[PDB]
Design a protein around this ligand. Structure first.
Ligand SMILES: Nc1nc2c(ncn2[C@@H]2O[C@H](COP(=O)(O)OP(=O)(O)OP(=O)(O)O)[C@@H](O)[C@H]2O)c(=O)[nH]1
Ligand SMILES: Nc1nc2c(ncn2[C@@H]2O[C@H](COP(=O)(O)OP(=O)(O)O)[C@@H](O)[C@H]2O)c(=O)[nH]1
Ligand SMILES: COc1ccc(N(C)c2nc(C)nc3ccccc23)cc1
Ligand SMILES: [Ca+2]
Ligand SMILES: [Mg+2]
Ligand SMILES: [Mg+2]
Lengths: 54, 437, 334, 427
């Protein structure tokens, strides 16, 4: 019912209508997580190459 | 004037980026080469459109956009396509091999080699800004690059640009058009890693867009081009307030203020009307009351859910075309008495309204018809948690047997990260429950 | 070949429905967790409505209306009648009722209690039945959960011979198109021991539940009087039919209750479809005036009528959506 | 995204030559290597299987391997023989004599280094290598023993690349020697560990299709290879042609293989044709969908009704209603939902290519990871134990240095695979 904050211009207009009232990880931590994942990849490839060496 | 940088990641992000930027160009009267005949201040300026376009001395208007894919094929079509002259080569970043539908391959393996290059190219656009306000990120939940690389980038942007706002345009996975069986894994994984780093996220369920295209546009089997042209119309409605003169949603901080009172519950539901077929002979033009009424039909929503069995935290109506305030208030009064609109007890039961007099621009030879008036409603309803429930259930079914998990572990990721991501999602589902009943 | 899933085992009604569906040879039952179903005969609690209508190439239907618990819980029904303009505070078919929490409308309840006291008229209430307000409130806190304090019907219609109390149960099925179907056969759940006006402690003659009664089986088998016998009694004893004296008011209450909630629960434009069977419970007073007691979300039928109602549920609720390769219902028009 | 193709042994080279014959026709390449097609859709991803030679002449990225000169001379003097790079022909002289041990340990070990030099030379030309596809039988000596020796060595030098195989299974119905269950079991043991994807081409099934359905009362190897090359064309369609799904070997592996060991696929094809006689009535979309899922059309002699589908990939070829394709594909899943695992949601994916194969207006190819494939491995295991319990014919293997222990281990790993497939049939 109550029409507040009415602002007009050439492009258009905007308003608010109320009907009823109420009642981060750092760069060092990122580089660590990515490299810990690379160590697990390298280990799994090394265990594969060791198995194929046998 | 405060500039915005658009970031398009993966197939879905890039292709939607094509659609959005083609649309922005037609709206501001910018030609495929980059010239803007209506623009009088050559080589610079701080008009409302300059939020999305920078200017060269030659008179070219270049998007503040960066396209990144771990695979060359999709951006190669941008490089050679009708809008090749619009972007400068440095804005378009491509890898050798894609993430193969694998989050871990996108985030950890192939992500690590390209992350520093991307942030450097982002820095090149950011250093052209006199007052950067933040980023608009376009990506899929389901893709390997879209899920994996996006969440790594979102982490890094919080470090380099900590004081800035980050908005998401995300593609929720749908079996109808999906490319991968592991898309529920990718979706839960990216949501968990991105949740703290995103300020407002607009979810788009491919299922909803697909049915709208079948039902309203009479397209038998909708392609990505069909979906993207529609998605771009919705994106354009959301972004219009940044690109045009107005007093509602003028900056990215206002999106958080107007739509997101609870930082974690930052997924507003978009609803758009009307979607009318271009090759429909004789169409009775819909009034303000009719198109506002369509904003509360679930068949017009970007996510299929029932707002009646949930609570609202915020509501925006963004009109484009022949619309006056008096018509809007009359429509709101009628709708309130006929429908179930339940706000939370700690919020005003109200609507923030923005009208732009310029009627929606449609792509020539498109599937969409020219309309006298259109509307996009953005509402933060607890009902959108239904989409989380669906996705979490699909995740649980696969994870119980540890199906496909070995592909993720093989890229260096740990099995603990899966269940950590699932716990955060369980917490998110709980947040919506506390607020919503 | 249509497909269904069963998620309520305790449901005596839908056990017979799942039996009847298989018997046609055009329905196959799937496992509980199979998403690829046409029909769901779902659980009473925590039914996952958000998962329904998301299977491409399948029309999905459920045997419950989402949001219809607002009519079926005692606390919710009072709140719904009191707030919705279609029913309003001055509802004349609903007894004076108040919502009470254990340590809300306590001061509002006591204001009506004093008007009854200073008016020196009948001041008996139900929660368990007592005449004193301070002895009722102490019982509510002693239990733990939320309860409704309702005006007790001190002067009910009493069946002869016996001087007995009763309640009427009506079975109502709302389909996917929101047609309201009242099943022609109702049942009178009777007291077998005479209604005592003075002693409210005796819970056997005041409450007409099928479990509390189980003089059981004296006048009719299993304390259940059917509609033909009750019509016949009213003609002989009061010079009126069941249709006029009682059934018009019953048809009015059912229709008013479900018309009220329609915009909140309707699945007219949704991606999934709903139907639901309801149990409306009615009290009749000595002046032949009908009062609503409770609405049931998961009602149980009476033994004589199980076969007929369950075939009706298949006919108008299930087969109307999924057709196969005289009507037992009265349609309440709106 | 480039693929290196290797063909080993008689069977491997025979089905391999037929593969290049069929797919060159689809891409519009004559036996000289010149392009004589009309559609540009043929050339968009031609780099996947072909290298572009100077003078604009295409060359298959194909390495031809055998321990005998006999079969490769049949390829060279054959129809499309001139298209293959003459250096990529690597041959021994004395053969493998249907002996896995000769292929893997003695005769094949002498020649394997020469093959790997050619593999490396092809790999260095590649902008981005996807990995490798091998065609071979498991019943012989070269394709079986040396083929699995190659895979093991290729995995050592390229551990971050995909290994795909087309593996022909032996049957008593189409039998060269008695020792084939020995050779197959020794091979399967290697494939379970060293491949990402294996197409199980059962000779039993190819025979039964030729006899029962195609009505050929005494089928040759040529009749058998006709069904193989038609399937091989179909399964590689999404690698060879641009679509909505830009598919590669890794994406197929990620999406089809829920558990690393269970990577044995049951291929299917509709409509079933024989050579010479052309069928004139084109099939409707409901007919293709009904046929490709039927056990009579499966290239592995398993009954899918005796198991459950973990994942399915379906490729429809020709000009047709994609709406009707989607409707029919959903129809099969909904009507038969008990035969698809509930714990992998939306486990059936469908792709459409506009280009049909030779002699067909429209066709359907089926790639299924069913638990019913255990029946194939049980059959080989039963034939193995019948001879091995009496240590029969074993001297051909111990004479080349193998111990009985190696047979017991290979028997064990395949029996493990069988119970591993059985695990997901119930829970
Ligand atoms: N709406 C829309 N959705 C798309 C489009 N392209 C892909 N998708 C959806 O995105 C999901 C797959 O993600 P993609 O973006 O294709 O994958 P990607 O980010 O390139 O990652 P990889 O290819 O796995 O490295 C699926 O659910 C598709 O339905 C598009 O142009 N529009
Ligand atoms: N389908 C098919 N199977 C074959 C062909 N040639 C041989 N085989 C089968 O392969 C097995 C023998 O392997 P072969 O390739 O001749 O031995 P290799 O040359 O030492 O590898 C037997 O089980 C045969 O049935 C062929 O051209 N097509
Ligand atoms: C079970 O879900 C799947 C399964 C396979 C895929 N991919 C990647 C496909 N790869 C290839 C090479 N061919 C196909 C043909 C037809 C359909 C898909 C593929 C995607 C999803
Ligand atoms: Ca300017
Ligand atoms: Mg991609
Ligand atoms: Mg031979």
């Amino acid at each position: 019912m109550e029409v507040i904050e009415l602002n007009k211009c050439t492009s258009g207009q905007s308003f608010e209508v109320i009907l009823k009232p109420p009642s981060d990880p750092s760069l060092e931590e990122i580089q660590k997580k990515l490299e810990a994942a690379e160590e697990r990849r390298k280990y799994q490839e090394a265990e594969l190459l060791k198995h194929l060496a046998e | 004037m405060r500039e915005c940088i658009s970031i398009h990641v993966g197939q879905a992000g890039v292709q939607i980026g094509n659609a959005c930027w083609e649309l922005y160009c037609l709206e501001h009267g910018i030609q495929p080469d980059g010239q803007m005949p209506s623009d009088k201040t050559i080589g610079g300026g701080d008009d409302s459109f300059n939020t999305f376009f920078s200017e060269t001395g030659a008179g070219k208007h270049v998007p503040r956009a960066v396209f990144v894919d771990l695979e060359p094929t999709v951006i190669d079509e941008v490089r050679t396509g009708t809008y090749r002259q619009l972007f400068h080569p440095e804005q378009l970043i491509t890898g050798k091999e894609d993430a193969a539908n694998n989050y871990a391959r996108g985030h950890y393996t192939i992500g690590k080699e390209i992350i520093d290059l991307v942030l450097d190219r982002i820095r090149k656009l950011a250093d052209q800004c006199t007052g950067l306000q933040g980023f608009l990120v376009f990506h899929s939940f389901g893709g390997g690059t879209g899920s994996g690389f996006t969440s790594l980038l979102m982490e890094r942007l919080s470090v380099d640009y900590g004081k800035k706002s980050k908005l998401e345009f995300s593609i929720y996975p749908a079996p109808q058009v999906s490319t991968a069986v592991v898309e529920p894994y990718n979706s839960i994984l990216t949501t968990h890693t991105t949740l703290e780093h995103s300020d407002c996220a607009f979810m788009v369920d491919n299922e909803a867009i697909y049915d709208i295209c079948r039902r309203n546009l009479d397209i038998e089997r909708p392609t990505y081009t069909n979906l993207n042209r529609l998605i771009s119309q919705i994106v354009s409605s959301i972004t219009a307030s940044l690109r045009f003169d107005g007093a509602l949603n003028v900056d990215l901080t206002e999106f958080q203020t107007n739509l997101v009172p609870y930082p974690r519950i930052h997924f507003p539901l978009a609803t758009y009307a009307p979607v009318i077929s271009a090759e429909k002979a004789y169409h009775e033009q819909l009034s303000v009351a009719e198109i506002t009424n369509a904003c509360f039909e679930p068949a017009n929503q970007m996510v299929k859910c029932d707002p009646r069995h949930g609570k609202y935290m915020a509501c925006c109506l963004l009109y484009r075309g022949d619309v006056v305030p008096k018509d809007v208030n009359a429509a709101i009064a009628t709708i309130k008495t006929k429908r179930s609109i339940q706000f939370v007890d700690w919020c005003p039961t109200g609507f923030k309204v923005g009208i732009n007099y310029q009627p929606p621009t449609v792509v020539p030879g498109g599937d969409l018809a020219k309309v006298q008036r259109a509307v996009c409603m953005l509402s933060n309803t607890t009902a959108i948690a239904e989409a989380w429930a669906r996705l979490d259930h699909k995740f649980d079914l696969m994870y119980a047997k540890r199906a496909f998990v070995h592909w993720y572990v093989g890229e260096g990721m740990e099995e603990g990260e899966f269940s950590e991501a699932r716990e955060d999602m369980a917490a998110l589902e709980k947040d919506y429950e506390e607020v919503g009943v | 070949m249509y497909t269904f899933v069963v998620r309520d085992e305790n449901s005596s009604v839908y056990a017979e429905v799942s039996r009847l569906l298989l018997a046609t040879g055009q329905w196959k039952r799937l496992r509980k967790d199979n998403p690829r179903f046409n029909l769901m005969l779902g659980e009473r609690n925590r039914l996952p409505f958000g998962r329904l209508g998301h299977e491409p190439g399948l029309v999905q239907l459920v045997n419950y209306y989402r949001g219809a618990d607002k009519l079926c819980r005692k606390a919710s029904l009072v709140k719904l009648i009191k707030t919705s303009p279609e029913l309003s505070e001055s509802c004349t078919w609903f007894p004076e009722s108040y919502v009470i929490y254990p340590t809300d409308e306590r001061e509002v309840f006591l204001a009506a209690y004093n008007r009854r006291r200073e008016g020196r008229e009948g001041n008996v209430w139900i929660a368990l039945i007592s005449s004193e307000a301070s002895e009722l409130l102490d019982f509510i806190d002693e239990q733990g959960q939320v309860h409704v304090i309702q005006k007790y019907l001190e002067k009910p219609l009493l069946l002869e011979p016996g001087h007995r109390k009763f309640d009427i149960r009506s079975w109502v099925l709302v389909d996917h198109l929101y047609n309201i179907y009242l099943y022609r056969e109702g049942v009178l759940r009777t007291s077998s021991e005479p209604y005592n006006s003075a002693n409210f402690q005796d819970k056997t003659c005041h409450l007409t539940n099928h479990c509390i009664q189980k003089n059981y089986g004296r006048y009719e088998e299993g304390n259940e009087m059917f509609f033909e016998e009750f019509n016949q009694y009213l003609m002989d004893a009061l010079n009126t039919t069941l249709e006029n004296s009682i059934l018009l008011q019953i048809k009015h209450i059912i229709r008013s209750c479900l018309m009220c909630i329609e915009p909140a629960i309707s699945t007219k434009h949704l991606h999934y479809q709903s139907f639901q069977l309801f149990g409306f419970d009615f009290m009749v007073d000595e002046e032949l005036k009908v009062w609503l007691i409770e609405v049931n979300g998961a009602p149980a039928c009476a033994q004589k009528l199980y076969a007929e109602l369950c075939q009706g549920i298949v006919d108008v609720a299930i087969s109307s959506v999924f057709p196969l390769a005289t009507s037992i219902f009265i349609k309440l028009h709106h | 995204r480039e693929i290196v193709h290797i063909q080993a042994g008689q069977c491997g080279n025979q089905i391999g030559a037929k593969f290049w014959e069929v797919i060159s026709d689809e891409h519009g390449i004559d036996p000289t290597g010149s392009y004589h097609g009309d559609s540009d859709l043929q050339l968009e991803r031609i780099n996947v299987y072909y290298n572009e030679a100077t003078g604009n002449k295409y060359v298959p990225r194909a390495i031809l391997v055998d321990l005998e000169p006999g079969t490769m001379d049949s390829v060279r003097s054959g129809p499309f023989g001139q298209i293959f790079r003459p250096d990529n022909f690597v041959f021994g002289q004395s053969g493998a004599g249907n002996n896995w041990a000769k292929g893997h340990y003695t005769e094949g070990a002498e020649l394997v280094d020469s093959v790997l030099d050619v593999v490396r030379k092809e790999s260095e030309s590649c902008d981005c290598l996807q990995g490798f596809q091998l065609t071979h039988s498991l019943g012989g000596g070269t394709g079986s023993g040396m083929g699995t020796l190659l895979i093991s060595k290729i995995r050592e030098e390229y551990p971050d690349r995909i290994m795909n195989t087309f593996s022909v299974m032996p049957s008593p119905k189409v039998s060269d020697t008695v020792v084939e269950p020995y050779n197959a079991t020794l091979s399967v043991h290697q494939l379970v560990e060293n491949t990402d994807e294996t197409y199980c081409i059962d000779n039993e099934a190819l025979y039964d299709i030729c006899f029962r359905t195609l009505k050929l009362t005494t089928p040759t190897y040529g009749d058998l290879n006709h069904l193989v090359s038609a399937t091989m064309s179909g399964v590689t369609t999404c690698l060879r042609f641009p679509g909505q799904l830009n598919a590669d070997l890794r994406k197929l592996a990620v999406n089809m293989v829920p558990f690393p060991r269970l990577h044995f696929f049951m291929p299917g094809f509709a409509p079933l044709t024989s050579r010479g006689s052309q069928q004139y009535r084109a099939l409707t979309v409901p007919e293709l969908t009904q046929q490709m899922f039927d056990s009579k059309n499966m290239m592995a002699a398993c009954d899918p009704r005796h198991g459950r589908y973990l994942t399915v990939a379906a490729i429809f070829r020709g000009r047709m209603s994609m709406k009707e394709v989607d409707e029919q594909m959903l129809n099969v899943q909904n009507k038969n939902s008990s035969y698809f695992v509930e714990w992998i949601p939306n486990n059936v994916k469908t792709a459409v290519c506009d280009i049909p194969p030779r002699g067909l207006k429209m066709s359907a190819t089926f790639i299924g990871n069913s638990t019913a494939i255990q029946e194939l491995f049980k059959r080989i295991s039963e034939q193995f134990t019948a001879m091995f319990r009496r240590k029969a014919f074993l001297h051909w293997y111990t004479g080349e240095g193998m111990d009985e222990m190696e047979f017991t281990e290979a028997e064990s790993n395949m029996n493990d695979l069988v119970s591993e497939y059985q695990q997901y049939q119930d829970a």
